[PDB]
């Protein structure tokens, strides 16, 4: 066992795994203790076997499993398809262009604070049906949560907001609006409760901004430091979708948890153990991704699981992809050449509280 803190950065996960993993996992004695799976095949299998690796608070749909979870996903699917993402892409594109245009003349920006976070949140609000006049309010909630408004009142403010949104749509339902649609939903033969409605809307808010923003930021930070890759992205548009997938692989950092239900789970765990599924290890397994630390837009096999796999695979994957690609497209139209302030120091992986300054 090792005294390993699961709040560690991806690089730390990978170093600890390199030194301590055997049989596809290492064990942490920290806190209540937990296993960390370290292989692509083992993590994929765990995501795909909920009878062995359980997800079971009530956060819809993240913490429910079985037939009720499948029914929630069926009801939600229409608002999160690739076709819906395409339908919304002219709005996403105009959003990116408007925002980047407003700071091109400065020659600098704090990428995530001034651009990516309000961009992504605006896009989320459009998809979910939250009035865009509320963006500044919701942005303040989101920022207070990152910087943990403040730690005490941020989440209560979000809870009041979703309660008020439900009440707005119940008074004036809108055809095609997600919240309005849920007033007609049944799950397991029972009308959806306002408590589950509020849970769903809360999960969408908490899931739908930060991961997208930080993938946008870590990707542009790499391009700003690597002129060869920047030039490739700029001059070879056909490679851009592959580049987005390669950055999703490389910049993965979530570590979804599961509860082992049986002896020998994953080859290593026992009944009652917490098991973590770090995407920073799955997506860097050299058995599947040779030279895993290398950003290679031409990587021939990129079966990454940046969005998970199995039944809980990210609902927002198509929408996140559209936002990242579109933002980087519009960025390179207006700002084809750019750099980090000191372009020859190795920058850190961006997570939690950071300030990504780009100049041009």
* Interface with ligand HEC (CB under 6 A): 61-62, 73, 124, 127, 203-204, 207-208, 211-212, 215, 254, 256, 306-308, 312, 314-316, 319-320
Question: Given the complex with ligand HEC, which of 87 and 337 has the nearer CB atom?
Answer: 87
Q: How far is the CB of 308 from ligand HEC (least distance, A)?
A: 4
Q: How far is the CB of 316 from ligand HEC (least distance, A)?
A: 2
Q: How far is the CB of 215 from ligand HEC (least distance, A)?
A: 4
Question: Given the complex with ligand HEC, which of 299 and 312 has the nearer CB atom?
Answer: 312
Question: Given the complex with ligand HEC, which of 42 and 256 has the nearer CB atom?
Answer: 256
Cis peptide before 61 (omega within 30 of 0): yes
Closest-CB residue for ligand HEC? 316
Q: How far is the CB of 342 from ligand HEC (least distance, A)?
A: 27
Question: Given the complex with ligand HEC, which of 266 and 316 has the nearer CB atom?
Answer: 316
Q: How far is the CB of 2 from ligand HEC (least distance, A)?
A: 24
Question: Given the complex with ligand HEC, which of 143 and 359 has the nearer CB atom?
Answer: 143
Q: How far is the CB of 222 from ligand HEC (least distance, A)?
A: 15
Return the half-sphere exposure (C-beta side, CA atoms, 13 A cut-off) of residue 124.
28
Question: Given the complex with ligand HEC, which of 92 and 204 has the nearer CB atom?
Answer: 204
Q: How far is the CB of 218 from ligand HEC (least distance, A)?
A: 10
d(CA 16, CA 38): 10
Question: Given the complex with ligand HEC, which of 203 and 359 has the nearer CB atom?
Answer: 203
Question: Given the complex with ligand HEC, which of 254 and 335 has the nearer CB atom?
Answer: 254
Q: Look up residue 100 and give its two tokens.
A: 């980047």
Q: How far is the CB of 252 from ligand HEC (least distance, A)?
A: 7
Do the Cβ atoms of 276 and 6 come closer than 8 Å?
yes
Please classify residue 207 by burial: count the beta carbons closer than 10 Å to its beta carbon, then call 0-12 exposed, 13-18 middle and 19+ buried: middle
């Amino acid at each position: 066992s090792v005294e390993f803190d699961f709040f560690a950065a991806p690089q730390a996960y990978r170093r600890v795994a390199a030194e301590h993993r055997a049989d596809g996992a290492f064990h942490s004695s920290r806190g209540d203790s937990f296993w960390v799976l370290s292989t692509y095949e083992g993590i994929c299998a765990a995501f795909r076997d909920e009878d062995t690796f359980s997800v079971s608070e009530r956060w819809i749909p993240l913490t429910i499993q079985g037939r009720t979870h499948n029914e929630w996903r069926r009801r939600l699917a229409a608002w999160f398809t690739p076709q819906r993402a395409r339908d919304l892409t002219p709005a996403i594109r105009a959003n990116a262009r408007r925002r980047i245009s407003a700071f091109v003349d400065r020659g600098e920006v704090s990428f995530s604070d001034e651009f990516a976070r309000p961009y992504v949140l605006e896009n989320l609000m459009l998809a979910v049906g939250w009035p865009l006049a509320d963006l500044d309010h919701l942005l303040a909630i989101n920022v207070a949560m990152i910087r943990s408004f403040n730690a005490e009142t941020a989440f209560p403010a979000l809870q009041e907001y979703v309660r008020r949104h439900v009440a707005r749509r119940r008074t004036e339902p809108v055809e095609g609006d997600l919240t309005s649609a849920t007033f007609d939903w049944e799950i397991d033969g029972t009308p959806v409760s306002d408590a589950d409605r509020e849970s769903l809307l809360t999960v969408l808010f908490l899931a739908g901004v930060d991961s997208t923003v930080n993938h946008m930021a870590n990707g542009i930070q790499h391009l700003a430091h690597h002129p060869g890759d920047r030039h490739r992205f700029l001059r070879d548009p056909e490679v851009r979708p592959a580049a987005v997938e390669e950055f999703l692989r490389v910049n993965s950092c979530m570590y979804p948890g599961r509860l082992a239900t049986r002896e020998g789970a994953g080859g290593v765990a026992s009944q009652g153990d917490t098991v973590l599924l770090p995407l920073a290890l799955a997506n860097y397994d050299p058995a599947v991704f040779p030279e895993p630390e290398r950003v290679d837009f031409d990587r021939e096999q990129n079966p990454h699981i940046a969005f998970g796999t199995g039944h809980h695979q990210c609902l927002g994957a198509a929408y996140a992809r559209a936002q990242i690609l579109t933002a980087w497209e519009e960025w390179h139209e207006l700002i084809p050449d750019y750099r980090l302030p000191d372009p020859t120091v190795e920058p850190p992986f961006l997570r939690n509280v950071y300030d990504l300054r780009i100049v041009w």
